[PDB]
Amino acid sequence: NKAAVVLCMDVGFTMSNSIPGIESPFEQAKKVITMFVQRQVFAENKDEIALVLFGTDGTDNPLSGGDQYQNITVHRHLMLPDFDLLEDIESKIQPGSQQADFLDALIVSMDVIQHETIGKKFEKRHIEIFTDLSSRFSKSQLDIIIHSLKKCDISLQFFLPFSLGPFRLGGHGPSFPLKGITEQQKEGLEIVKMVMISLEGEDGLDEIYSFSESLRKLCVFKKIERHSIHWPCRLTIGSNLSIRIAAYKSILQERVKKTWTVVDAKTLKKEDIQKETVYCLNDDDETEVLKEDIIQGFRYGSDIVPFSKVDEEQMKYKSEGKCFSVLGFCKSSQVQRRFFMGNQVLKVFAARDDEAAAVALSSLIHALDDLDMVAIVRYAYDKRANPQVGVAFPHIKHNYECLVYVQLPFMEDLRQYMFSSLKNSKKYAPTEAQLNAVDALIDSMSLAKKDEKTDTLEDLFPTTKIPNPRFQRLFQCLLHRALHPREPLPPIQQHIWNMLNPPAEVTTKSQIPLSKIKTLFPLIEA
Amino acid sequence: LLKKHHYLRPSLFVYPEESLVIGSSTLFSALLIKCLEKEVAALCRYTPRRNIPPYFVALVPQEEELDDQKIQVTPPGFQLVFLPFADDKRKMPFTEKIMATP
């Protein structure tokens, strides 16, 4: 699968205006687009990217023959991104004095997508538009653009300098204070909101982001992420009942998909370096042995028991794979989250086509939810995969319902550690003042707030939506090394630390209780 | 706000040591008591070893529990649960919701 992404960039003079104490919107947009391109490049993604800039002094596009659609340039046609685009954007892209609208840029992007998509089959078409909405625009073609978007079924996203004292990029706070917005900006916001709500209904209101927010939300790649491969199986309560189901990996730790290759300093080729393993006996002669002269064994308490690979395979525990069997149903209170094992969480839905399995799974989920019970299941990916015991519990949502499965521990997987109680310890017994101080500290460092007393909680620091900083740091360092081979790695970006740090309000509230606790609580190293 | 299905890594157990810093046991006990009575779990950046990316984790207080024989089964301390990052999640395919008759 592959997709086309057209990035619309405003280089107007208003963007270059850097308000004191706040990073210029142009810098934020450049950072966001650079992060997007870095992720798309270093991730080895078969995606086509093009860049269109409006507001440039020059003009270069198919629809620039006459006086219409001026100050629009196509810096790159649809094609696989490379280091050339990163070098061009990082160094030789500057703001343009001339001011240009954005609907013309959108039309140019549509024309480019239509022209380039003829020669290839693309599953998804995407457009991302980064503007401050400070330029006059013509509303004559609103119907035409809306109809073209509806017919071409291409996703569209908008990024603005302001979201719908000190300022930090991605600091979990207000990026652009709502004091200084001009009438033109209000009109641009209104028109873009109309376009988004018409295109995607009420859900489109969440499709307009901010540069600071987008820098720590992983939203640019929201619509160009490939679906996980479905695992088909049959949930079998007994020998006569079977429901066709499909399982997906809802949560899985993400790592680097590319390894580091060792090459010679003199010649940067892996062929020169050769690694070999030699086996020697425990003797003075250090006689070497061959691979065929080696056997596998195990220790048996000071005794060595040889165990050949063929012997192990013959005596290996044999079972049939691809099984999802319910061993029973137990009260949800009997399963504790602290005992959860494994490195993944499975989401199980019904089959894709049939509806009988859908209704059966819905009935099972509803029964489990209303009876406050979970199903103990035997999970086995394939024949080779070792069988495991896990817990599946219902997960019902307004738009979908499924079964969430998490592995459970075995008897030998548990550790029996005995600790010393703290409640009944005389030496370790905080006084009333200590409890009051800890209460004050906990209250002053609350990460959740009441949502207008609407029986809902709003999260001040939603770490679950924070992207992993290691990938961004690695991409930044790799790009710096590539573009500047004769320079050292740069320091971690400030916005990364801002997104990895709590809002300044919490620290300001906690300043005093923290000092009070420090004064009250003795702390001496030993 | 700690979703049960948001499971990434097996949880760990944090217990006061007092071998390095003296007087930490009382502060740990006070924090455990207040968190238990408030049903609030601490949030902390965790870096196990040197040169390791940090991970956001939640320390949920644990209340000591004993069986009928007065044998420890849930030692007191903190339960460290790893909170997945944005990229640790995956996008599921859209599925129409189908209800079931009573």
Partner: peptide, 24 residues
């Protein structure tokens, strides 16, 4: 201490694995 394993002192005597025992 009650329940202490006779084989490995200092460790609780793990109960035998029963599996699934359907109730009445």
């Amino acid at each position: 201490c009650p329940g202490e394993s006779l084989i490995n002192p200092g460790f609780k005597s793990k109960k035998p694995a029963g599996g699934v025992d359907f109730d009445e």
